[PDB]
Design a protein around this ligand. Structure first.
Ligand SMILES: Nc1ncnc2c1ncn2[C@@H]1O[C@H](COP(=O)(O)O)[C@@H](O)[C@H]1O
Ligand SMILES: Nc1ncnc2c1ncn2[C@@H]1O[C@H](COP(=O)(O)O)[C@@H](O)[C@H]1O
Ligand SMILES: N[C@@H](Cc1c[nH]c[nH+]1)C(=O)O
Ligand SMILES: N[C@@H](Cc1c[nH]c[nH+]1)C(=O)O
Lengths: 276, 276
């Protein structure tokens, strides 16, 4: 029996639910229900406050959780980070009023507002800088305008929020975060393998294309696949169909290369999961 | 120019907006806008995270805030509590698995989950009890079931949430909370007076009733009003109309008493605000 924590709301919740569904686990279909019992897989899913997931895994009975690396860092929980899941990427930055040459040294003795004060205190300590870290619940940007803080430390996605409050990021990031599968410090191995199959498989597309036999050597070099491309005859003896897994991020350039050597009906399909 | 913080969401937000509107301040009509400029009254309203209001008032440029007494306590902010506003009442309690004789002494060495850890640590210190306080973002009840904590400390309204998670409250309350108007440690006096007028006035109804002249002494004793009841003749010389402010909570018993001495057309009306 495994117990897995999943963010109940926020930007990580849907993608986390999707990755688990993709791995074959039962979905939360009625969204107002905080628990999902998966008899088939013998897993119980608990839909918890995003901020709290790491504590539940590190100090509770939960075997795994999906949450953000920054939140794990801020929680102080001792958990194993097993996989980065391919969503929820962001960078955590210090920021202060725009138009000034803020650098890390300026942080000394500042009041720094943040919703991740442990993460911020640890970063300052590493830098050898003393400052006054002020915990806020969120929406931290407005704290500078309203006189609570001199600077902030917060998640930076597009950077839109900072610009909207006339703030500019400075310094190296405090954390480069991504959603992660964390495990409490055979059943467990199965779940990690299944989630890994989705993480890995979502990076590829399956490419199928018709190729003239005269172009087969060239095509084989363009799409080597994970082991070696699959080659099957067409009814027309002068042609074959080739199948190869290709990185999702290179598929267009690959299609262009194949078209240039005479490939036809070049198509891509999604895969659910893949074990190398 | 005054700056006032108002909860942007949660159970205190609507009543806080209403009390300010009742006091004559400009309403937030477009709810998605975090600021409201009130040129007429020279007040700017900032709609902030409920948890953060006390820090903004205590350490920021905000002159006042409406928030909960428990949140002020947990914030550690040094602010003046000027008025209790008549809404948001609750009690903060320790709770643990139902069916057992939990008492305060049992808390020693326990892991106690709560979203108000400062409030809880101060209460434990007063009691001379050491324990491990675990900060959670909210939805703390499930923490006992999931093995993160032995007990919780949380707001108790109806008590429904505790019962739903098989928990029972024990011990004296850690705080008896209510929504409050807090001020940073002539313009300010005006705002307090105006909010006070609403707080005070909302406790009364204005009662008007027709009364036979033969019953006037008895009626006067039943409704003495705040100074003395207003008495005005009706067109019918054998009658008068009496007006008196009466506590909202006693109005029905008062109406019964008046009806028993022959009063007719006994009615109550709301008032907006009242200065004693
Ligand atoms: N704590 C967070 N965890 C994951 N993504 C976030 C977080 N905070 C902000 N983002 C994302 O960052 C994107 C834009 O970044 P920004 O304009 O800097 O706020 C938004 O679409 C958010 O979904
Ligand atoms: N932090 C809070 N501040 C003000 N009211 C609250 C708070 N938490 C819960 N309540 C109220 O308490 C009521 C019911 O209490 P309970 O079943 O004990 O959760 C709910 O209708 C809530 O609006
Ligand atoms: N050879 C088939 C299917 C196919 C298209 N591309 C690759 N294979 C045609 O249609
Ligand atoms: N005397 C009026 C108004 C009134 C009703 N009750 C008290 N005053 C009648 O109608």
């Amino acid at each position: 029996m495994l117990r897995v924590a999943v963010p109940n709301k926020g930007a990580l919740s849907e993608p986390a639910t999707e990755i688990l569904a993709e791995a074959g686990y039962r979905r939360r279909t009625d969204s107002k229900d905080l628990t999902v019992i998966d008899p088939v897989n013998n897993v119980e899913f608990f839909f918890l406050r995003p901020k709290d997931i790491a504590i539940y895994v590190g100090s509770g009975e939960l075997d795994f959780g999906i949450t953000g690396r920054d939140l794990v860092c801020d929680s102080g929980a001792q958990v194993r980070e097993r996989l980065a899941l391919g969503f929820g990427s962001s960078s955590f930055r210090y920021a202060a009023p725009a138009g000034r040459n803020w650098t890390t040294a300026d942080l000394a003795g500042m009041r720094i507002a943040t919703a991740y004060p442990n993460l911020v205190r640890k970063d300052l300590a590493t830098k050898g800088i003393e400052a006054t870290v002020i915990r806020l619940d969120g929406a931290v940007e407005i704290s500078v305008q309203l006189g609570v803080a001199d600077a902030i430390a917060d998640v930076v996605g597009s950077g839109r929020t900072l610009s909207q409050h006339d703030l500019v990021a400075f310094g190296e990031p405090l954390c480069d975060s991504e959603a992660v599968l964390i495990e409490r410090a055979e059943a467990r191995d199965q779940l990690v393998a299944r989630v890994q199959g989705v993480v890995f498989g979502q990076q590829y597309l399956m490419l199928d294309y018709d190729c003239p036999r005269s172009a087969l050597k060239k095509a084989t070099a363009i799409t080597p696949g994970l082991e070696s491309p699959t080659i099957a005859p067409l009814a027309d003896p002068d042609w074959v169909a080739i199948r190869a897994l290709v990185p999702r991020r290179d598929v267009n350039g690959i299609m262009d290369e194949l078209a240039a050597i005479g490939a036809k009906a070049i198509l891509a399909s999604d895969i659910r999961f893949c074990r190398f």
